Amino acid sequence: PNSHKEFTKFCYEVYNEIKISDKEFKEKRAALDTLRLCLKRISPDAELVAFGSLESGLALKNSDMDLCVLMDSSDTIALQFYEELIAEGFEGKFLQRARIPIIKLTSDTKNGFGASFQCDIGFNNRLAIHNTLLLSSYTKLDARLKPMVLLVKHWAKRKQINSPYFGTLSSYGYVLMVLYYLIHVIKPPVFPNLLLSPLKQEKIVDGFDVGFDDKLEDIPPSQNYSSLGSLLHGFFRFYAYKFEPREKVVTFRRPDGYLTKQEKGWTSDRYILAIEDPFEISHNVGRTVSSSGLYRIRGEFMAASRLLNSRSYPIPYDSLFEEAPIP
């Protein structure tokens, strides 16, 4: 009811079903090891770094790898790396848009992997490596973050509100919505803001400050004793009824988490849902969200709150993950 015992038990049971298996994680590490050898051929000085969900442990079963090629010196290596992969029996796309190259491996011919093999490779994407570090740090700080993030991702995918190409929000946007709630909304806070810590030292990477208090062993445990179910209950309630998407920005650069679109200059490339990236401050993670997309997102937050506040016991908690029709 307050510690939402039956909802918490339900949440952990689902988390154990949707989290990545030991088998799948070992296969993706095997795939990274193979791809690292192809890059070594072209440049022994180049580095293939994994980032995103799998590196921060926030991945759902059957995930896609988000890789990055770190060069000191994209310059020539991108087209050269793609050539080697094609020659090694890999299928995929090479995309060259806005002077930035991307490799999208769609399949594998003759290796220890199959056709279901999907993998994205970027070049000198240093900022995404830093967002992964920040997210990893927070998971290492409290054991409730990983199940909370996975369950919100599973819910967003099932309710069809996780499509940045169809007017809704990316998985990364939901992670930042979860973190924002846990740092600046819930009382007592679940986490401190590591970017605004007095122990934070400046670190400039690609003209953005990527510094945060990363000495985690010295950060005390949370002062908030809420169960996983209670945490999720409050999250859905906040974004369903309390958060003002018209005038406010989800931010990690204000001590009280209070920031208006007017102050940011994100009024009148969309700013319908405003989520300020913690490092790339000029980037709105919610820029893909349309007005119709925001109404579906709020619509699903309200349905989630309604379910968790039903008067009719038992509560059909499974309906939270029931697949919604394609819009």
XYZ file of C-alpha atoms in Angstrom:
327
model
C 0.000 0.000 0.000
C 2.766 2.485 1.071
C 5.698 0.049 0.642
C 3.523 -1.549 -2.182
C 4.627 -5.102 -1.178
C 2.714 -7.094 -3.824
C 3.741 -4.545 -6.521
C 7.414 -4.722 -5.393
C 7.359 -8.599 -5.540
C 5.765 -8.321 -9.044
C 8.439 -5.776 -10.180
C 11.395 -8.006 -9.161
C 9.731 -11.103 -10.770
C 9.405 -9.197 -14.123
C 12.927 -7.688 -13.817
C 14.404 -11.229 -13.557
C 12.522 -12.213 -16.793
C 13.403 -9.084 -18.921
C 17.063 -8.526 -17.794
C 19.952 -9.700 -20.092
C 21.062 -13.343 -19.596
C 24.637 -14.456 -18.834
C 24.544 -16.302 -22.203
C 23.558 -13.196 -24.289
C 26.041 -10.898 -22.448
C 28.928 -13.357 -23.143
C 27.899 -13.508 -26.880
C 27.972 -9.671 -27.182
C 31.422 -9.606 -25.476
C 32.529 -12.296 -28.068
C 31.181 -10.063 -30.898
C 33.049 -7.026 -29.479
C 36.272 -9.137 -29.267
C 35.902 -10.187 -32.961
C 35.186 -6.543 -34.126
C 38.170 -5.257 -32.030
C 40.504 -7.519 -34.074
C 39.201 -6.049 -37.381
C 39.944 -2.494 -36.169
C 43.439 -3.646 -34.936
C 44.247 -4.692 -38.548
C 43.557 -1.145 -39.954
C 44.958 0.802 -36.988
C 46.704 -0.790 -33.948
C 46.458 2.668 -32.238
C 42.608 2.887 -32.683
C 40.263 1.837 -29.843
C 36.814 0.194 -30.017
C 34.770 1.246 -26.964
C 31.312 -0.057 -26.007
C 28.807 2.435 -24.627
C 25.057 2.642 -23.930
C 22.691 0.186 -22.165
C 24.966 -2.910 -22.190
C 27.902 -0.985 -20.631
C 25.754 0.597 -17.864
C 23.811 -2.681 -17.319
C 20.500 -1.021 -18.322
C 19.833 -3.343 -21.288
C 16.781 -5.501 -21.973
C 17.011 -8.983 -23.581
C 17.902 -9.009 -27.364
C 19.615 -5.570 -27.297
C 21.736 -3.897 -30.021
C 25.395 -2.923 -29.416
C 26.383 0.744 -29.393
C 30.062 0.970 -30.333
C 32.496 3.861 -30.837
C 35.893 4.060 -32.560
C 38.310 6.285 -30.576
C 41.093 7.816 -32.649
C 43.576 10.459 -31.481
C 44.848 11.838 -34.898
C 36.762 9.358 -38.494
C 39.307 11.077 -40.913
C 39.756 7.919 -43.181
C 39.442 4.988 -40.744
C 35.564 4.831 -40.957
C 35.434 3.760 -44.668
C 38.491 1.573 -44.116
C 36.897 -0.147 -41.062
C 33.682 -0.786 -43.036
C 35.756 -2.371 -45.914
C 37.477 -4.859 -43.498
C 34.130 -5.808 -41.859
C 32.565 -6.491 -45.325
C 35.659 -8.639 -46.249
C 35.352 -10.531 -42.893
C 31.798 -11.616 -43.893
C 29.746 -8.852 -42.220
C 26.702 -7.232 -43.799
C 25.570 -3.702 -43.137
C 25.189 -0.060 -44.067
C 27.654 2.789 -44.266
C 25.957 6.151 -43.672
C 27.645 9.499 -44.414
C 25.402 12.440 -43.318
C 26.339 15.922 -41.865
C 30.139 15.108 -42.164
C 29.720 12.231 -39.581
C 30.192 8.541 -40.577
C 28.155 5.653 -39.068
C 28.379 1.855 -39.573
C 25.167 -0.128 -39.019
C 25.940 -3.865 -39.079
C 22.622 -5.575 -39.946
C 23.917 -9.231 -40.136
C 26.899 -11.733 -40.076
C 27.708 -14.384 -42.793
C 30.439 -16.856 -41.578
C 31.395 -16.305 -37.860
C 30.089 -17.443 -34.407
C 27.081 -15.053 -34.759
C 23.926 -14.957 -36.948
C 21.517 -12.743 -38.948
C 19.843 -11.366 -35.738
C 23.223 -9.525 -35.163
C 22.519 -5.729 -35.060
C 25.335 -3.286 -34.113
C 25.988 0.481 -34.460
C 29.538 1.860 -34.776
C 30.245 5.616 -34.393
C 33.494 7.601 -34.670
C 34.958 9.774 -31.859
C 31.613 9.842 -29.946
C 33.355 10.796 -26.690
C 30.255 12.438 -25.056
C 28.136 9.199 -25.197
C 31.002 7.349 -23.363
C 30.729 10.000 -20.587
C 26.904 9.652 -20.310
C 27.463 5.868 -19.921
C 30.034 6.538 -17.109
C 27.543 8.791 -15.251
C 24.742 6.175 -15.572
C 27.133 3.312 -14.464
C 28.185 5.371 -11.408
C 24.549 5.811 -10.259
C 23.827 2.034 -10.667
C 26.885 1.304 -8.453
C 25.437 3.759 -5.837
C 21.971 2.117 -5.338
C 20.771 -1.401 -6.246
C 17.192 -0.163 -7.017
C 18.215 1.856 -10.131
C 18.838 -1.084 -12.552
C 15.403 -2.791 -11.981
C 13.608 0.605 -12.024
C 15.203 1.636 -15.377
C 14.568 -1.788 -17.006
C 10.901 -1.823 -15.936
C 10.359 1.760 -17.245
C 12.065 0.750 -20.584
C 9.912 -2.440 -20.844
C 6.765 -0.388 -20.086
C 7.684 2.338 -22.668
C 8.397 -0.311 -25.392
C 5.147 -2.259 -24.612
C 3.028 0.959 -24.578
C 4.627 2.036 -27.967
C 5.956 5.345 -26.489
C 9.658 4.463 -27.086
C 9.802 5.459 -30.829
C 11.959 8.604 -31.469
C 11.239 8.203 -35.235
C 7.404 8.202 -34.667
C 7.127 11.299 -32.410
C 7.994 9.811 -29.013
C 11.013 9.399 -26.695
C 14.265 7.391 -26.755
C 15.260 4.866 -24.022
C 17.939 7.372 -22.953
C 15.207 10.028 -22.426
C 13.327 7.709 -20.028
C 16.574 6.951 -18.108
C 17.077 10.723 -17.601
C 13.392 11.040 -16.547
C 13.965 8.247 -13.949
C 17.253 9.852 -12.680
C 15.726 13.335 -12.509
C 12.856 11.947 -10.331
C 15.361 10.116 -7.998
C 17.692 13.120 -7.557
C 15.472 16.252 -7.649
C 11.844 15.165 -7.028
C 11.587 12.355 -4.420
C 12.134 13.352 -0.748
C 14.454 12.304 0.888
C 16.494 12.084 -2.376
C 17.482 8.601 -3.608
C 20.710 10.069 -5.104
C 22.847 13.221 -4.908
C 23.530 15.228 -8.094
C 27.121 14.092 -8.956
C 27.582 17.005 -11.446
C 26.772 19.708 -8.836
C 28.826 18.069 -6.017
C 31.491 20.314 -4.317
C 34.007 17.453 -5.019
C 33.309 17.710 -8.788
C 36.388 18.781 -10.826
C 36.024 20.398 -14.301
C 36.906 18.173 -17.314
C 36.383 19.591 -20.831
C 35.764 17.065 -23.663
C 34.525 18.398 -27.095
C 33.736 21.840 -25.541
C 31.477 20.359 -22.828
C 32.169 19.863 -19.107
C 32.017 16.045 -18.520
C 33.233 16.229 -14.873
C 31.357 14.735 -11.881
C 32.152 13.305 -8.410
C 33.243 9.764 -9.420
C 34.765 8.786 -5.971
C 31.638 6.612 -5.259
C 33.100 4.669 -2.292
C 33.010 8.017 -0.353
C 29.362 8.788 -1.250
C 27.157 7.629 1.687
C 24.221 5.207 1.068
C 20.806 6.726 0.270
C 18.676 8.299 2.962
C 15.556 7.033 1.114
C 14.240 3.575 2.153
C 11.402 3.273 -0.412
C 10.771 -0.100 -2.061
C 11.095 -0.589 -5.869
C 7.263 -0.567 -6.161
C 6.920 2.671 -4.168
C 9.673 4.319 -6.307
C 7.831 3.334 -9.566
C 4.437 4.426 -8.118
C 5.865 7.942 -7.384
C 7.662 8.148 -10.792
C 4.436 7.492 -12.779
C 2.468 9.897 -10.541
C 5.025 12.720 -10.986
C 5.134 12.632 -14.789
C 1.355 11.881 -15.047
C 0.097 14.792 -12.863
C 2.875 17.001 -11.318
C 5.502 17.636 -14.062
C 4.667 20.663 -16.311
C 5.981 19.728 -19.821
C 4.806 23.079 -21.223
C 7.036 25.344 -19.117
C 9.676 23.134 -17.522
C 12.936 21.374 -18.423
C 14.195 18.044 -16.982
C 17.662 19.246 -15.874
C 20.773 18.090 -13.943
C 22.416 21.559 -13.810
C 20.205 23.235 -11.132
C 20.613 22.437 -7.367
C 16.787 22.268 -6.903
C 16.133 20.790 -10.393
C 14.020 23.888 -11.257
C 14.501 25.211 -14.811
C 12.035 26.874 -17.206
C 12.066 26.734 -21.059
C 12.075 30.573 -21.025
C 15.321 30.595 -18.950
C 16.946 27.920 -21.189
C 15.723 29.673 -24.364
C 13.830 26.538 -25.491
C 10.566 28.202 -26.630
C 8.820 28.749 -30.079
C 14.290 21.037 -33.380
C 11.160 20.606 -31.122
C 10.989 21.645 -27.440
C 7.514 20.067 -26.716
C 9.209 17.785 -24.114
C 12.400 19.408 -22.797
C 15.105 17.119 -21.320
C 18.485 18.908 -21.052
C 21.317 16.380 -21.659
C 23.542 16.451 -18.481
C 26.789 17.101 -20.518
C 25.744 18.281 -24.038
C 23.633 21.112 -22.439
C 22.624 22.461 -25.912
C 20.989 19.092 -26.792
C 17.329 18.361 -25.939
C 17.021 14.588 -25.540
C 13.214 15.069 -25.943
C 13.512 16.891 -29.348
C 11.938 13.839 -31.132
C 8.679 14.152 -29.106
C 5.762 15.726 -31.042
C 2.584 17.224 -29.450
C 0.599 14.020 -30.299
C 3.554 11.958 -28.976
C 3.558 13.905 -25.653
C -0.232 13.368 -25.282
C 0.301 9.568 -25.714
C 3.238 9.605 -23.211
C 1.221 11.551 -20.557
C -1.787 9.362 -21.465
C 0.261 6.223 -20.615
C 1.680 7.780 -17.390
C -1.904 8.508 -16.275
C -3.036 4.917 -17.125
C -0.021 3.522 -15.129
C -0.897 5.757 -12.066
C -4.604 4.746 -12.322
C -3.702 1.013 -12.305
C -1.422 1.380 -9.237
C -4.160 3.367 -7.422
C -7.133 0.964 -8.165
C -9.654 0.413 -5.327
C -10.453 -3.066 -6.694
C -7.981 -5.548 -5.100
C -6.183 -7.622 -6.486
C -4.563 -5.162 -8.896
C -3.827 -6.536 -12.392
C -0.160 -5.352 -12.418
C 0.497 -7.392 -15.611
C -1.690 -4.950 -17.628
C 1.168 -2.376 -17.073
C 3.227 -4.442 -19.549
C 0.326 -5.593 -21.841
C 1.209 -4.714 -25.466
C -0.577 -1.575 -26.739
C -1.709 -1.454 -30.443
C 0.613 0.137 -33.085
C -0.502 3.818 -33.652
